[PDB]
């Protein structure tokens, strides 16, 4: 995001996408769908999709992250707060769901 060349922007975004997808698959195979680590992977994917201008499924990623974080860590927890903060930053800045 802090770069200026658009080709470099897209290439590093896709590299981060590949790294997050590989990490998500490893975590999902190891632990399972309902875990904090998989939820962190989902939140990383959501914020990356926000950074990749794909805001339609960024909301889906963030809500999938929060519904797993708040189910295990309760409605009030640090990871839950960070994930809902990412979702709010997605809503108010780019998806115009003020």
């Amino acid at each position: 995001i802090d770069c200026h060349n658009k080709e470099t922007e897209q290439r590093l975004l896709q590299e981060a996408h590949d790294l997050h997808l590989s990490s998500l698959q490893l975590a999902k195979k190891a632990f399972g769908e309902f875990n904090v680590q998989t939820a962190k992977h989902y939140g990383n994917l959501g914020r990356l999709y926000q950074s990749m201008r794909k805001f339609k499924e960024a909301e889906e990623m963030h809500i999938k992250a929060i519904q797993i974080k708040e189910q295990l860590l309760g409605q009030e927890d640090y990871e839950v707060a960070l994930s809902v903060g990412h979702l709010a930053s997605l809503y108010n800045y780019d998806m115009n769901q003020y």
Binding site: I1, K40, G43, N44, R47, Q50, S51, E79, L82, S83, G85, H86, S89, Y93
Partner: peptide, 9 residues
């Protein structure tokens, strides 16, 4: 700085 920091490592 649009977003917050990463969840964890």
């Amino acid at each position: 700085l649009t977003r917050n920091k990463g969840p964890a490592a």
